[PDB]
Design a protein around this nucleic acid. Structure first.
Ligand SMILES: [Mg+2]
Ligand SMILES: [Mg+2]
Ligand SMILES: [Mg+2]
Ligand SMILES: [Mg+2]
Ligand SMILES: [Mg+2]
Ligand SMILES: [Mg+2]
Ligand SMILES: [Mg+2]
Ligand SMILES: [Mg+2]
Ligand SMILES: [Mg+2]
Ligand SMILES: [Mg+2]
Ligand SMILES: [Mg+2]
Ligand SMILES: [Mg+2]
Ligand SMILES: [Mg+2]
Ligand SMILES: [Mg+2]
Ligand SMILES: [Mg+2]
Ligand SMILES: [Mg+2]
Ligand SMILES: [Mg+2]
Ligand SMILES: [Mg+2]
Ligand SMILES: [Mg+2]
Ligand SMILES: [Mg+2]
Ligand SMILES: [Mg+2]
Ligand SMILES: [Mg+2]
Ligand SMILES: [Mg+2]
Ligand SMILES: [Mg+2]
Ligand SMILES: [Mg+2]
Ligand SMILES: [Mg+2]
Ligand SMILES: [Mg+2]
Ligand SMILES: [Mg+2]
Ligand SMILES: [Mg+2]
Ligand SMILES: [Mg+2]
Ligand SMILES: [Mg+2]
Ligand SMILES: [Mg+2]
Ligand SMILES: [Mg+2]
Ligand SMILES: [Mg+2]
Ligand SMILES: [Mg+2]
Ligand SMILES: [Zn+2]
Lengths: 43, 53, 122, 112
RNA sequence: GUUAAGUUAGAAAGGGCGCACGGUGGAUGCCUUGGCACUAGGAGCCGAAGAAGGACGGGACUAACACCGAUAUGCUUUGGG
RNA sequence: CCGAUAGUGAACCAGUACCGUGAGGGAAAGGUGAAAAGCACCCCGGAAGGGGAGUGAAACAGUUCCUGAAACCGUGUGCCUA
RNA sequence: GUAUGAGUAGCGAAAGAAGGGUGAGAAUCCCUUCCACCGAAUAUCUAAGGUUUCCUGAGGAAGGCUCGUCCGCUCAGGGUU
C-alpha cells in the first residue's frame, strides 16, 4: 500500500513555508492569527 | 459467544476450587541430611545413591 | 519411536548431533524426553564398534559427524570422532553386553521448566 | 516480650494472583520445611517469596533473639499495589489495555 | 455378646451471613499561590533614528525558566539604603 | 463571586505535550513538617524493599508526603451449608 | 477509578545442537565446532527520508509481546577534515 504522506523537504517549505505565507494578503492573515494564540511555531 | 450476565463473586470463587497446585514430592537425603526430590540427583551434596556423580 | 517437535529431516539431523557429542565428551546435558532417544542410537553405534569390520565402519561412518575430537602430536595428526569410537570407546565395553549409558535426573530448567538430565557413557 | 517478626516486600513486579498461588503452600508450616517447598516448586514467584521468608527469619533472631529451629509461619498474604497501564496495538487501528500489576508480600514467623 | 427392625448425631473439597484487621483508589473537610465582575484616578499607540514577534547566543559547572546582547547573568551618572 | 471536575483553555515551565500535509483542534497535573532536623549505625538482599536504632508533638507525616469515603482485592474467625 | 469474560485468546511466515566463560542469577549474553537458510538476494554501493540512532565505559526501574549479565533503551564522555 502507498500511503498519503510522502515526505519531502523542498515540497514542504514551498507550500506551507513562511515566505509563502508572507507573499499573500490571506497568507499574512494566517501568521497574524497564529500570533494571537501565541503559538510556539509559525508556518 | 459473548457473556449474558456478569459472574458473581460466589461463582467466580467456586470455579477456582481446583485451580490450586500440589505439594512437591520431596524427601530427606541420608548423607547431607537436607530436603531432596525423590529419584533425583541431590543438588548440593552433588550425589545420588551415594556415588557422587 | 517418538517425534521431538520437529519434522523428519530435522529429527535425523538432531539425533546425529547429540549422538556424536556423547561420544566426544562422554557426558552431556539434554532434556528428559530428548535423552531417552539418543540412548538407543548410541548403544546401536557402540555395537558397530565391537565388530570392527570395514563393513561396520562404513555403516557407522554414515551417522557420525566429522569433527576433530583432539589433535595428537605424533608431525600433527588430528583425531576424528569415528577413530575414537572404534579404537577407544569400543574396546572399553568388550565384556559388557548391553547398557553402555546411564541417565540421571537433575531438575527443572529456569527458562521453560523443562526437566533436565545427565546422560553418561559408562 | 516480642513473640513474632515480620518482613514485607513493597511493589514487587508480579501479578497478585500469580504469587497468591504459592503462598497457600507454605501457610502453617515450619520455616525449615517451608524453605524447601519454595525450592522445589517451579514457579516464578518462588525466588521472591523465598527471599522474603528468609529475611523475616533473619530479623527474628537478630532483633528479638528467637530460635531458628523452633519457628513456624502463621501469617502469609499478598496484597495489591499500583498497577501500570500500557497498550497493545490490535488490528484495524484499535488499541487494547494491558495491566502490569504489582504486589505486596508479607510473611510473619513466630515460635510454637 | 450375635442377629433383625427402627431412630438420631457429625462432617466442609469449597461456599453464604456477621465481625476484626489490612491493601488499592481518591471522594469529602480545611487551605490558597490563581482566576471572575466592577469603582475611582491615569493613559489610549509603536515604526526607515528600523517596529510588534522571533532565531541564535552570554554563567566555573547550564538541559529549562527569568535577565541581557560580542561592552551579552551586565557598563556610566544622579539620588535612596 | 469561585475555591483545584469549581474559577480563564492554562493556580503547576499552557496554547505546552499530543493529533493533522495544512488551515486548525487541544489536554492531564496544587498540599511532608513549625523547622530537613529528609532515617549516623546494626541485620536479611545483587538491588529494590524491609526489621530495629535515632530526629520529630506525630514516621499508620519517609521526597503524590494534610484528611483518606465507595467500588475492587485479601487474611482470621462465631452461626449455617453436599 | 475498579471489576466479569480469565490465568482464557494471543505471544506477528523460518533449524538448531553441544562444550567452555562471565555472572547473585543463563534456552535467550560472549567464544568454539558441527548442522541448516538466501545467493538477479535475505549480497555490495548510492539517492530520498530520518536527525545522533554512530564509538567507548558504566546500568537493569520502565521499553523489548517471555528471560536477559544484552540492546536501535538509561547515564557520562567522544566522533562527521
Ligand atoms: Mg507543489
Ligand atoms: Mg527433505
Ligand atoms: Mg479507525
Ligand atoms: Mg495500520
Ligand atoms: Mg466450612
Ligand atoms: Mg485575590
Ligand atoms: Mg488603532
Ligand atoms: Mg544621530
Ligand atoms: Mg534562549
Ligand atoms: Mg544552561
Ligand atoms: Mg550610589
Ligand atoms: Mg481547571
Ligand atoms: Mg481536593
Ligand atoms: Mg507536526
Ligand atoms: Mg509545606
Ligand atoms: Mg529503615
Ligand atoms: Mg549486601
Ligand atoms: Mg535501605
Ligand atoms: Mg521504628
Ligand atoms: Mg521521641
Ligand atoms: Mg497526629
Ligand atoms: Mg500529635
Ligand atoms: Mg496542618
Ligand atoms: Mg495519605
Ligand atoms: Mg473501605
Ligand atoms: Mg483496571
Ligand atoms: Mg472460555
Ligand atoms: Mg480452550
Ligand atoms: Mg516471532
Ligand atoms: Mg552452559
Ligand atoms: Mg540452499
Ligand atoms: Mg541525508
Ligand atoms: Mg551501537
Ligand atoms: Mg521483560
Ligand atoms: Mg544508547
Ligand atoms: Zn544430599
Amino acid at each position: 500500500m502507498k500511503r498519503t504522506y510522502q515526505p519531502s523537504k523542498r515540497k514542504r517549505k514551498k507550500v506551507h513555508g513562511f515566505r509563502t505565507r508572507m507573499s499573500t494578503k490571506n497568507g499574512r492573515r494566517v501568521l497574524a492569527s497564529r500570533r494571537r494564540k501565541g503559538r510556539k511555531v509559525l508556518s | 459467544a459473548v457473556p449474558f450476565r456478569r459472574t458473581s463473586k460466589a461463582k467466580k470463587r467456586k470455579r477456582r476450587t481446583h485451580v490450586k497446585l500440589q505439594l512437591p514430592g520431596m524427601n530427606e537425603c541420608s548423607n547431607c541430611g537436607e530436603y531432596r526430590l525423590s529419584h533425583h540427583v541431590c543438588p548440593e551434596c552433588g550425589q545420588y545413591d551415594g556415588k557422587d556423580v | 519411536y517418538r517425534k521431538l517437535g520437529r519434522t523428519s529431516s530435522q529429527r535425523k539431523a538432531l539425533l546425529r548431533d547429540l549422538a556424536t557429542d556423547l561420544i566426544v565428551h562422554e557426558r552431556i546435558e539434554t532434556t528428559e524426553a530428548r535423552a531417552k532417544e539418543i540412548r538407543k542410537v548410541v548403544e546401536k553405534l557402540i555395537t558397530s564398534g565391537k565388530k570392527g569390520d570395514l563393513h561396520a565402519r562404513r555403516q557407522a561412518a554414515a551417522f557420525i559427524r566429522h569433527e576433530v575430537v583432539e589433535v595428537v602430536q605424533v608431525k600433527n595428526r588430528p583425531v576424528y570422532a569415528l577413530q575414537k569410537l572404534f579404537d577407544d570407546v569400543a574396546p572399553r565395553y568388550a565384556e559388557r553386553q548391553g547398557g553402555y549409558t546411564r541417565i540421571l535426573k537433575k531438575g527443572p530448567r529456569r527458562g521453560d521448566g523443562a526437566p533436565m538430565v545427565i546422560i553418561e557413557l559408562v | 516480650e516480642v513473640t513474632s517478626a515480620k518482613a514485607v516486600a513493597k511493589t514487587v513486579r508480579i501479578a497478585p494472583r500469580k504469587a497468591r498461588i504459592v503462598i497457600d503452600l507454605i501457610r502453617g508450616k515450619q520455616v525449615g520445611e517451608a524453605i524447601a517447598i519454595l525450592k522445589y516448586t517451579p514457579r516464578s514467584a518462588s525466588p521472591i517469596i523465598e527471599k522474603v521468608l528468609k529475611s523475616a527469619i533473619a530479623n527474628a533472631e537478630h532483633n528479638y533473639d528467637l530460635d531458628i529451629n523452633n519457628l513456624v509461619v502463621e501469617e502469609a498474604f499478598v496484597d495489591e499495589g499500583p498497577t501500570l497501564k500500557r497498550f497493545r496495538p490490535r488490528a484495524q487501528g484499535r488499541a487494547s489495555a494491558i495491566n502490569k500489576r504489582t504486589s505486596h508480600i508479607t510473611v510473619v514467623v513466630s515460635e510454637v
